[PDB]
């Protein structure tokens, strides 16, 4: 069983991760709360695309609230005392929030394309997006379960996607969870936003560089901030072996990859208010008014 090496996490990485997570958590919460306050309070800002932006902001806020604290608890405690149902919901809420965020990004890209393409210029879209996001997270809500173990003397409890499950489709999900997540929550929104924004820029060519620069920055930050976690999980699924001492090092390094990637995902959640500040004069003044007083 031994890999010729234990599994453990360096303390330097833990300190770095704690500081980065604290800063990104604070920044994202402040930015998204300020954006929501601005959009709701100001009547002139209550409009279709602004409601899409508010949907994206609320999704990002709920994503931040549910991820950073639990990962901090994991790193600083290495225990899950919350029971089976709490870990039954946390993956469900997390995936629902990620789906809401990605689909809101898609919808907002579509809205910008329409605004720049047609000059004649949402409730059904937001409800449709959110309902579809909640249902797609159901497998997580019925899948995870707690299992007990002895490991080199220490008695442990882990809540995970238990390999043994009841139905054929539930087993299929147990086997293809990571592939499904990488093919839906990452590739689909990236492709949709990039394509629609490319169409918007192409139309601007048919009819200002700063807005294109903002588009490029948003898409690039999304990619660079959501890539690492998917990369870590696919590396687990691809290079993890068994029966021989060639797997523990991969697990130890994957801990680092996963925690870095979740920090980057939180940073992507945090990014949008900063962009809407540095780009939009109306939002710039709104942030100045709300924050400075």
């Amino acid at each position: 069983p031994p890999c010729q090496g234990p599994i453990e996490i360096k303390e330097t990485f833990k300190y770095i991760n704690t500081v980065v997570s604290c800063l990104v958590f604070v920044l994202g919460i402040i930015g998204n709360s300020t954006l929501l306050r601005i959009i709701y309070k100001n009547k002139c800002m209550r409009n279709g695309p602004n409601i899409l932006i508010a949907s994206l902001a609320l999704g990002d806020l709920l994503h931040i609230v549910i991820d950073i604290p639990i990962n901090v608890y994991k790193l600083l405690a290495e225990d899950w005392p919350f029971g089976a149902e709490m870990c039954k919901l946390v993956p469900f809420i997390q995936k629902a929030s990620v789906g809401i965020t990605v689909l809101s990004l898609c919808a907002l890209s579509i809205d910008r394309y329409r605004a720049v393409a047609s000059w004649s210029r949402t409730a059904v879209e937001i409800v449709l997006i959110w309902v579809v996001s909640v249902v797609l997270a159901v497998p997580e809500a019925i899948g995870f379960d707690i299992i007990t173990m002895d490991y080199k003397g220490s008695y442990l409890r882990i809540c995970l996607l238990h390999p043994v499950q009841k139905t054929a489709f539930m087993q299929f999900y147990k086997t293809a969870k990571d592939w499904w997540l990488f093919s839906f929550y990452f590739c689909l929104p990236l492709a949709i936003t990039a394509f629609f924004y490319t169409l918007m820029t192409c139309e601007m060519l048919r009819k200002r560089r700063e807005v294109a620069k903002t588009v490029f920055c948003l898409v690039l930050v999304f990619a660079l901030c959501w890539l690492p976690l998917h990369l870590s999980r696919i590396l687990k699924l691809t290079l993890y072996n068994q029966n021989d001492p060639n797997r523990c090092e991969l697990l130890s390094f994957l801990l680092v990859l996963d925690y870095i990637g979740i920090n980057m995902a939180s940073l992507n959640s945090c990014i949008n208010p900063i962009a809407l500040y540095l780009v939009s004069k109306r939002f710039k003044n709104c942030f100045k008014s709300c924050l400075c007083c």
Binding site: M149, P163, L229, L251
Partner: peptide
């Protein structure tokens, strides 16, 4: 995280130390 079974001790230990995702 995902494991092949309960016999692979190291995979489930990684699940213990891994993030909730």
């Amino acid at each position: 995280c995902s494991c092949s079974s309960l016999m692979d001790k190291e995979c489930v230990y990684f699940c213990h130390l891994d993030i909730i995702w």
